[PDB]
Amino acid sequence: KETAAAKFERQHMDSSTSAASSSNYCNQMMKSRNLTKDRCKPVNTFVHESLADVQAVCSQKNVACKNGQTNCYQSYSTMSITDCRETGSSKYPNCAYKTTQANKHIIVACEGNPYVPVHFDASV
């Protein structure tokens, strides 16, 4: 089965664009990345940075995750991100999202060896 690390990349990485370029970015990306296959995932962030840079966060500022776990890390730098949030008109299988571009620090949880991000916690 797909690894947690691979799932992170699939759900959260978009190194191919520097930012969302239209209001349809989330609609298209949530679909292409298979995030609307079983149900509409309600919230999802895409990170417009190199994978290595995001992987590096695992060696940055240790912080408790939202749920209390202590394997979260906050980026020292802001990153370009796109927040995808389901809209009022979203109705499975026609999931609809509002696209929001921002530059924020990201908080991810890391695991493994190599120690890499496996979950997107928050943007701050």
UniProtKB/Swiss-Prot annotation:
Cysteines joined through disulfide linkages: C26-C84, C40-C95, C58-C110, C65-C72
EC number: 4.6.1.18
Mutagenesis or variant effect for H119A: Loss of activity
Catalysed reactions listed for this entry: an [RNA] containing cytidine + H2O = an [RNA]-3'-cytidine-3'-phosphate + a 5'-hydroxy-ribonucleotide-3'-[RNA]; an [RNA] containing uridine + H2O = an [RNA]-3'-uridine-3'-phosphate + a 5'-hydroxy-ribonucleotide-3'-[RNA]
BP terms from Gene Ontology: defense response to Gram-positive bacterium
Keyword Hydrolase tagged: yes
Effect upon mutating H12A: Loss of activity
Record: residues binding substrate: K7, R10, K41, P42, V43, N44, T45, K66, R85
Membrane-spanning parts: none
Location of the active site: H12 (proton acceptor), H119 (proton donor)
Molecular function as annotated in GO: lyase activity; nucleic acid binding; ribonuclease A activity; RNA nuclease activity
Cellular component aspect of the GO annotation: extracellular region
Localization of this protein: Secreted
UniProt keyword annotations, A-Z: Disulfide bond, Endonuclease, Glycation, Glycoprotein, Hydrolase, Lyase, Nuclease, Secreted, Signal
Glycosylation, residue list: K1, K7, N34, K37, K41
Keyword Magnesium listed: no
Tissue expression remark: Pancreas.
Family: Belongs to the pancreatic ribonuclease family.
Subunit structure: Interacts with and forms tight 1:1 complexes with RNH1. Dimerization of two such complexes may occur. Interaction with RNH1 inhibits this protein. Monomer.
Chain's role: Endonuclease that catalyzes the cleavage of RNA on the 3' side of pyrimidine nucleotides. Acts on single-stranded and double-stranded RNA.
Protein name in the entry: Ribonuclease pancreatic
Organism: Bos taurus (Bovine)
Span within the parent record: 27 to 150 of 150
